[PDB]
PDB file of C-alpha atoms in Angstrom:
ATOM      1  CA  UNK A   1      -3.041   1.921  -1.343  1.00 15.62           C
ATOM      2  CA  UNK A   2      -5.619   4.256  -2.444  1.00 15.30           C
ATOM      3  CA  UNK A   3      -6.700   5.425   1.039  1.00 14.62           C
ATOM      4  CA  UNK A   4      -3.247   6.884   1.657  1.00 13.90           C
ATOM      5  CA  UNK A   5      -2.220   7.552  -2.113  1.00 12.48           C
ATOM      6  CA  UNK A   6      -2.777   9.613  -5.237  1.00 14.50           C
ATOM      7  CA  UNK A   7      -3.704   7.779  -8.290  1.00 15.40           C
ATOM      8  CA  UNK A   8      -0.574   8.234 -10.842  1.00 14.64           C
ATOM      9  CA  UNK A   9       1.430   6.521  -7.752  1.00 13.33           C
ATOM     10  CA  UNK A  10      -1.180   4.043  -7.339  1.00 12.23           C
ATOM     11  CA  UNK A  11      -1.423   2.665 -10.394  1.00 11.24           C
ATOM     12  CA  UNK A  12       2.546   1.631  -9.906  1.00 12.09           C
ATOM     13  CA  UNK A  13       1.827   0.046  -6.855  1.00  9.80           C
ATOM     14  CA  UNK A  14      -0.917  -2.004  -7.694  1.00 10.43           C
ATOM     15  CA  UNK A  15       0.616  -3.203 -10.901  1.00 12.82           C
ATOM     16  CA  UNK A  16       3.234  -4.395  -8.772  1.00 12.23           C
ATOM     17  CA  UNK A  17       0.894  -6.989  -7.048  1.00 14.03           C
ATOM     18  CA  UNK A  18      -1.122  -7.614  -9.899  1.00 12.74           C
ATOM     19  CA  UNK A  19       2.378  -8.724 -11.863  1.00  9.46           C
ATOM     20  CA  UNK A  20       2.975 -10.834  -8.401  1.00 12.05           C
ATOM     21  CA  UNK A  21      -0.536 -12.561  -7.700  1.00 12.52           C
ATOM     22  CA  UNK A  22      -0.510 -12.999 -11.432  1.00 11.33           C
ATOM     23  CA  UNK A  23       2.812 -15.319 -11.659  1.00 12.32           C
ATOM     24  CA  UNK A  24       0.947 -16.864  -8.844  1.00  9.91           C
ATOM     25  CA  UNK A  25      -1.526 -18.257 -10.858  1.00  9.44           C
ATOM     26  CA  UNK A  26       0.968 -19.209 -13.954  1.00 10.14           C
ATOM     27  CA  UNK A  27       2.766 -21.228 -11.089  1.00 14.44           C
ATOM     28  CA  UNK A  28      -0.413 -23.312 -10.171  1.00 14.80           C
ATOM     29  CA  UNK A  29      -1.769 -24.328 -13.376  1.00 17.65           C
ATOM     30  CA  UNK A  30       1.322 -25.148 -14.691  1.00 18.69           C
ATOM     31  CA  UNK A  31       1.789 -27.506 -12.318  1.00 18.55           C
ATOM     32  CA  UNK A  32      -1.389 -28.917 -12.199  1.00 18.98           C
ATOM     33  CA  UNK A  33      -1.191 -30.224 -16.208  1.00 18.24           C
ATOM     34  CA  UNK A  34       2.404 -31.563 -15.264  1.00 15.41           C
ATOM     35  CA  UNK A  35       0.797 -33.609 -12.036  1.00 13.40           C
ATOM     36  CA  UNK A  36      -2.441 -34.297 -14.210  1.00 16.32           C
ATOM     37  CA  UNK A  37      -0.588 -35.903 -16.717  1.00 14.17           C
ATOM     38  CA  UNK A  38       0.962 -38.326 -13.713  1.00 15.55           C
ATOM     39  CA  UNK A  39      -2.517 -38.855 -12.384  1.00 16.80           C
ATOM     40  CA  UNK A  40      -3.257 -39.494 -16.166  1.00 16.28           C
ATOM     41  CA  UNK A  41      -1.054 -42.278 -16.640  1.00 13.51           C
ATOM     42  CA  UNK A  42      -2.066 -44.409 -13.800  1.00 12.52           C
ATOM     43  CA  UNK A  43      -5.616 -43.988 -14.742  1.00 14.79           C
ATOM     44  CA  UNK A  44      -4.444 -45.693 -18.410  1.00 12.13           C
ATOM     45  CA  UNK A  45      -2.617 -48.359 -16.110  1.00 11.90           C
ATOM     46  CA  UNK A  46      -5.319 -49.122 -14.350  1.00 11.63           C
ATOM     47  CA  UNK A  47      -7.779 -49.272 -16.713  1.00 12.83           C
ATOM     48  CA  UNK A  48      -4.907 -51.629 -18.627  1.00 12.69           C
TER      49      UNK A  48
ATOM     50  CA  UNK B   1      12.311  23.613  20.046  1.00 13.80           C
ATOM     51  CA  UNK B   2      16.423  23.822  18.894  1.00 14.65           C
ATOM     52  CA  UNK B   3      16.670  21.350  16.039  1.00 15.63           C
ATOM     53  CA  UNK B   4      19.312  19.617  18.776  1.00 11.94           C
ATOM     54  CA  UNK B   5      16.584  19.379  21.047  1.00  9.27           C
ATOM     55  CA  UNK B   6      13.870  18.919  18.631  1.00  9.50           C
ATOM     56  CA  UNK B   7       9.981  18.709  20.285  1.00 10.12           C
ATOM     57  CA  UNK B   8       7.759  16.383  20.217  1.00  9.36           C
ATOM     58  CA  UNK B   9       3.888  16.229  21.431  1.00  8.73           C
ATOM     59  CA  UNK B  10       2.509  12.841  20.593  1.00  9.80           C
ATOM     60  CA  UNK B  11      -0.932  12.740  19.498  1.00 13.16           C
ATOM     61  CA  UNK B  12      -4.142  10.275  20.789  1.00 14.22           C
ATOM     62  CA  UNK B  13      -7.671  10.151  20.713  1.00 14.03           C
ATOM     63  CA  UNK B  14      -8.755  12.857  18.686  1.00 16.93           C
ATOM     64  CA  UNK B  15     -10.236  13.730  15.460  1.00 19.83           C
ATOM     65  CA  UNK B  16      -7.531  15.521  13.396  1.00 19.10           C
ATOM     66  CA  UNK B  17      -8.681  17.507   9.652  1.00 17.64           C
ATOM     67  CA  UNK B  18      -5.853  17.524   8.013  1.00 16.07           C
ATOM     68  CA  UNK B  19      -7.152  19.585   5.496  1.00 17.21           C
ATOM     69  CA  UNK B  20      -6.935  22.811   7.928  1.00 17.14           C
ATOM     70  CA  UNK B  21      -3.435  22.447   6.973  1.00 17.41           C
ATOM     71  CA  UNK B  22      -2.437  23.008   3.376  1.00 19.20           C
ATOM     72  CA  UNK B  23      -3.983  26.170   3.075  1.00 18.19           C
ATOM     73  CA  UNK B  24      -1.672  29.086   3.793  1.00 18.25           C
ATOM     74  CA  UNK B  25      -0.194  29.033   0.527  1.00 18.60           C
ATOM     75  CA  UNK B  26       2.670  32.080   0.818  1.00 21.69           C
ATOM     76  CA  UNK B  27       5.067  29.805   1.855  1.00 22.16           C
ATOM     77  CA  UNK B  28       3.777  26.504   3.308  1.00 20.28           C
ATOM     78  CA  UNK B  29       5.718  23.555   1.691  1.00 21.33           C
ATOM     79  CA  UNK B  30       3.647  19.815   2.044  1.00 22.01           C
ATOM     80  CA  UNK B  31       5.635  17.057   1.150  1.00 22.81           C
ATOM     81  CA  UNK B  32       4.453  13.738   1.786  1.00 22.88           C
ATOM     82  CA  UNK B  33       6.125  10.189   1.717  1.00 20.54           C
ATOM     83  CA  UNK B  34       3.936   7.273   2.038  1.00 23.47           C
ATOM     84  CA  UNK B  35       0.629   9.137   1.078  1.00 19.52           C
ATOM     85  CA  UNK B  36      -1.342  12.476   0.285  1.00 18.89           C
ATOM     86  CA  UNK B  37      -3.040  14.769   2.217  1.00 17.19           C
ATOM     87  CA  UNK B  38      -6.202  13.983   0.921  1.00 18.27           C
ATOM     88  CA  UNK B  39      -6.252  10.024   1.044  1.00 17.99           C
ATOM     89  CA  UNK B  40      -5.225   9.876   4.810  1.00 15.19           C
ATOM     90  CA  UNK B  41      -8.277  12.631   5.873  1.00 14.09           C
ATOM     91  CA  UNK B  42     -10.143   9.247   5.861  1.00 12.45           C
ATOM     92  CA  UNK B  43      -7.676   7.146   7.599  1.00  9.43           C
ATOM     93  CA  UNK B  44      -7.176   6.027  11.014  1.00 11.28           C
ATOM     94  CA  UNK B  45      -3.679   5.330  13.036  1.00 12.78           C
ATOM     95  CA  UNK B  46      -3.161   4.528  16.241  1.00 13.88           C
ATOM     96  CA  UNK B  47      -0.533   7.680  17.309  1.00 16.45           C
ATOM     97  CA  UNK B  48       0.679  10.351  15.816  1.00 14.15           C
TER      98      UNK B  48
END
């Protein structure tokens, strides 16, 4: 982006992926404490 | 060229300094989409 762009233009550009890659991450860990709580509960029936 | 029969020399294998262009202020106009004339001086393409 930089390489072939000025800074006040950049800025928008790279807050675009930043916003992107960012609900990335809100995606994954979300779902990992709904599929650890799964995980969770067999561990309690097993140990049942 | 006629605009109709517009001209066009395509470019290989050659360093190009953009920055001789720019200069000639009177009544050069420079208007870039996709990048600045500045950023690109250290850019590489395949043609041109």
């Amino acid at each position: 982006i930089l390489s072939r762009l000025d800074p006040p233009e950049a800025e928008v550009q790279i807050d675009r992926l930043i916003t992107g890659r960012l609900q990335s991450l809100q995606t994954y860990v979300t779902q990992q404490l709904i599929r650890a709580a799964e995980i969770r509960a067999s561990a309690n029936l097993a140990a049942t | 060229a006629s605009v109709y029969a517009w001209n066009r020399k395509r470019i290989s294998n050659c360093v190009a300094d953009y920055s001789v262009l720019y200069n000639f202020a009177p009544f050069f106009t420079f208007k870039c989409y996709g990048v600045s004339p500045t950023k690109l001086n250290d850019l590489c393409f395949t043609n041109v």
